[PDB]
Design a protein around this nucleic acid. Structure first.
Lengths: 168, 116, 146
RNA sequence: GCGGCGCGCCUGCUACACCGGACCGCAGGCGUCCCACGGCGGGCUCAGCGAGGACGGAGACCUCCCGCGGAGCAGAAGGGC
């Protein structure tokens, strides 16, 4: 009645996403917000194509993302569950056992509201990985992971329930 | 989220007398040197005893002409008509919302739609 | 005279000309409820160059602002007398002024009210002078969705 | 017949399975463009099927997953990767 110890679940990484069109310097202003929280330099993703509704024009930086892992991942995500009152919508868990939530106010995460830094909403998405997934990413011997070892959303909701005592 | 030093549940169960000491001048003197009228007072016990006796979804949401009666912490959790000068405006009182006149939350005016 | 211009505190530059008093009400204005009722005296010099003021005098001044009641400033001088929060009388400093303004405005939106519509629609609240007075700039009841 | 230019040149047909095969026959292009749109070495996987995530929906981003090329390689089309 014991699972193999490699069958545990680990938070491989957390992505942090903003989408401030491009405005005049807004993407740079979100860079400051991401830098303090993750202690990392957020990389500016770029707009693809030029569309009418938003102001992206095939070259405006439209979003900033940093991927945080390990101890930083636990604390940044734990913040995100407290501010989301330990409640998450049930459908957030996805097919590959990846789930996300929305974070109003870069300030609500304990950052001080600033006249200089205007409120910027961000969103999160946490990727759950079963030890042994290296077979999918190694430069040599790159082969797809087997069915059992892939995290099914039901199994991951159980790891989220066990990890943060959340409710849906 | 916490209101006047009381958490939402504490102020919700707190009496009108309890939230009155820390409140604005209009609210403190509403009962401090004055009180309530007998018509105003009766209306309180026409929703109070209904708010505390829920048998399911409320079938009341009574329509009341009375408008500028300062709301009571207990009356939180229910929708009041707060009649504007023409049609009743259904208003659900938030727990932080208490401590001010039901007049503030009711709109008797047109928002804009002119500027021609 | 060691006038020592700048001496910026609270992320707000000051001047070698400003007297020790205007220096705080002039700390962006935001962050100092003034009228200098306690500011006129504090423990700092009434009329001297504000850079010349010693750090020790400035640090004691920083402490009196940090705990107004401990200085002995009466509550009426301070801005937040009753608080809709933990209900505790408090002063307002520079960053908290605009955070508390968000608290006052965003609360207004969540608790929908005539006083909130008269701010989200940008109509001047209270005065009802959006009738024939403020042609000024176009901050008047206009509208045109279609 | 100067209304057109098959008057030099190229792709796919017509073309009758080596090749060569006509026509003011069809379906189209060429007369340029780029010191990076070049050379090389390294990394990388693309359009997208889904299923998820502040605002955020046909649609903008960020994730995984399955992704034989269904992408882009300056322009004609056909090979090719």
């Amino acid at each position: 009645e014991s699972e193999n110890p490699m069958r545990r679940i680990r938070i491989e990484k957390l992505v942090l996403n903003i989408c401030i069109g491009g405005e005049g310097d807004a993407l740079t202003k979100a860079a400051k917000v991401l830098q303090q929280l993750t202690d990392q330099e957020p990389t500016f993703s770029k707009s693809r194509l030029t569309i009418r509704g938003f102001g992206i024009r095939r070259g405006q930086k439209i979003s900033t993302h940093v991927t945080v892992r390990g101890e930083k991942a636990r604390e940044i995500i734990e913040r995100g569950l407290r501010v989301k009152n330990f409640e998450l919508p049930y459908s957030c868990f996805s097919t590959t056992g990846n789930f996300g939530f929305g974070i109003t106010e870069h300030i609500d995460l304990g950052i001080k509201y600033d006249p200089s830094m205007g409120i910027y909403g961000m969103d999160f998405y946490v990727v759950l990985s079963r030890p042994g997934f290296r077979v999918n990413k190694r430069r040599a011997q790159q082969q797809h992971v087997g069915a059992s070892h892939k995290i099914t959303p039901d199994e991951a909701r159980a790891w989220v329930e066990r990890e943060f005592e959340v409710v849906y | 989220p916490n209101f006047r030093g009381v958490e939402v549940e504490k102020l919700a169960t707190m009496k009108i007398t309890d939230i009155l000491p820390k409140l604005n001048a209009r609210c403190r003197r509403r009962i401090g040197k004055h009180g309530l009228s007998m018509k105003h007072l009766r209306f309180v016990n026409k929703l109070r005893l209904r708010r505390a006796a829920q048998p399911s979804q409320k079938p009341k949401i009574v329509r009341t002409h009375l408008r500028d009666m300062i709301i009571f912490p207990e009356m939180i959790g229910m929708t009041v008509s707060v009649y504007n000068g023409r049609q009743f405006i259904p208003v659900e009182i938030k727990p932080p919302m208490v401590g001010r006149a039901l007049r503030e939350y009711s709109m008797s005016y047109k928002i804009v739609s002119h500027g021609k | 005279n060691d006038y020592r211009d700048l001496l910026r505190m609270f992320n707000t530059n000051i001047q070698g000309k400003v007297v020790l008093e205007c220096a705080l009400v002039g700390i962006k204005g935001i962050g100092r409820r003034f009228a200098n009722v306690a500011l006129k005296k504090a423990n700092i010099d009434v009329h001297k160059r504000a850079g010349e003021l010693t750090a020790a005098e400035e640090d004691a001044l920083m402490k009196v602002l940090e705990d107004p009641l401990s200085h002995g400033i009466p509550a009426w001088m301070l801005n937040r007398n009753n608080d809709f929060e933990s209900g505790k009388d408090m002063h307002i400093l520079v960053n908290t002024i605009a955070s508390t303004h968000r608290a006052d405005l965003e609360r207004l939106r969540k608790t929908r009210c005539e006083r909130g519509v008269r701010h989200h629609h940008n109509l001047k609240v209270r005065g009802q002078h959006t009738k024939s007075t403020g042609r000024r700039g176009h901050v008047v009841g206009v509208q045109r969705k279609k």
